[PDB]
């Protein structure tokens, strides 16, 4: 609810890569809250957006993106080339208990470290 | 690549809930591979589907669903009432290195256990 500085410890392919974040207000147009890394130039922002909906059903949406850049010869600032979009949506109903929601949550949280997905992401060979 | 029995250990709101899976072939229409729990009745299947695409960009899609049921008075078999859909899509480019993909992967994998998301899922109060 009352969000603060989320910092994740030691993630990314191995070992020693921490990740700090800061809140960046609430977008009142649709309720999306934003989290961002204190980068050097604000066009290079590791950003994580979360949201929730209201009724039908529910649309809990987490949309994470983190572009990278390169000092291309021809511009003053460094410039973005590629994106790294990722998004995940959760759909529930009015009558779902606490157990089902927690089950789906940590099931996805544990299944994202299974070797099936690390093959299917870092080398993209399917099943 | 060569997929086998994925079983996750001790997930869901607390403690003692394991989860076995089995492969269920490859759907040749679009390449989607399926994983499923050996349930009693095959209409109640904890299922996880994975896929990948080919070019533009990439569309690595993980679509997980697990209905629950109740013995409603009026039918022989138990019947499904609600769903618990969840899906997550990853979009990359041709020029993304290994580092960015692994970073986005385990960043989402660690961020799904942050207290922000457990509030926003199990009690749905936003930021």
């Amino acid at each position: 609810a009352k969000l603060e500085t989320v910092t994740l410890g030691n993630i990314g392919k191995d070992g020693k890569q921490t990740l700090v974040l800061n809140p960046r207000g609430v977008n009142p147009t649709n309720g999306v809250a934003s989290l961002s890394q204190a980068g050097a130039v604000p066009a290079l922002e590791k950003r994580v957006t979360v949201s929730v909906s209201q009724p039908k059903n529910y649309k809990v949406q987490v949309k994470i993106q983190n572009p990278t850049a390169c000092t291309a010869n021809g511009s003053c600032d460094p410039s973005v080339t590629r994106q790294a979009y990722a998004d995940v949506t959760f759909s529930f109903t009015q009558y779902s208990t606490d157990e089902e929601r927690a089950f789906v949550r940590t099931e996805l949280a544990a299944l994202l470290a299974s070797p099936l997905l690390i093959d299917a992401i870092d080398q993209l060979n399917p099943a | 690549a060569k997929l086998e029995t994925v079983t996750l250990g001790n997930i869901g709101k607390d403690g003692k809930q394991t989860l076995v899976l089995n492969p269920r072939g490859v759907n040749p229409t679009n390449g989607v591979a399926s994983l499923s729990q050996a349930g009693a009745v095959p209409a109640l299947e904890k299922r996880v589907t994975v896929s990948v695409s080919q070019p533009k960009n990439y569309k690595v899609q993980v679509k997980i669903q697990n209905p629950t049921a109740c013995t409603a008075n009026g039918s022989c078999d138990p019947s499904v009432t609600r769903q618990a859909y969840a899906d997550v899509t990853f979009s990359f480019t041709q020029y993304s290195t290994d580092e960015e993909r692994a970073f986005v992967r385990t960043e989402l994998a660690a961020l799904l256990a942050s207290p922000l998301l457990i509030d926003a899922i199990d009690q749905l109060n936003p930021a």
Partner: antibody
Amino acid sequence: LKQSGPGLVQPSQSLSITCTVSGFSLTSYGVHWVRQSPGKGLEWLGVIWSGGNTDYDAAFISRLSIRKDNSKNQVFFKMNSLQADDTAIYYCARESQNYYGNTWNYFDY
Amino acid sequence: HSDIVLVSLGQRATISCRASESVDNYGISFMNWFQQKPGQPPKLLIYAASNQGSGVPARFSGSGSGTDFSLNIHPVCQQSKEVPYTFGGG
């Protein structure tokens, strides 16, 4: 948490300890190991977490193999050539990789 | 790197360390506190140097910035955490 391992071993051999966990899920946490002797208070946190196999204590690289599993939560480790003056009691711990402001989960043995 | 530290009305333990260990945006002071009973593993005291450990009574607290820490327990082991979490006793 649970704890089971053979004790009172003759010196200059290997020595292994297993541990399970029945609380959290081992994927998004970490396991810590300390010794406690009558000589010193308690010692290193050369440990592993997240599934990423990681660092050790600086003095004891020459020993201390470590493994992490997900079959059911086995975090069993071993020691090669147990020197005879390594007389202590070994303790395991949990750790959360989840800094959130300052309220942050930590050290339930 | 290492550090050194030492019926009513309370007393307190002091501290001395080299690095102030201020790695992040003010959730920084990773200094901790431990007391143990003999037949038990050591229960967790206040973590992050001022933040009222999980399941502790309210009479325990700590305060102070980096390399300057304190206790206050007036009605009635130390460790630091930068990279290898080495420390000593008291």
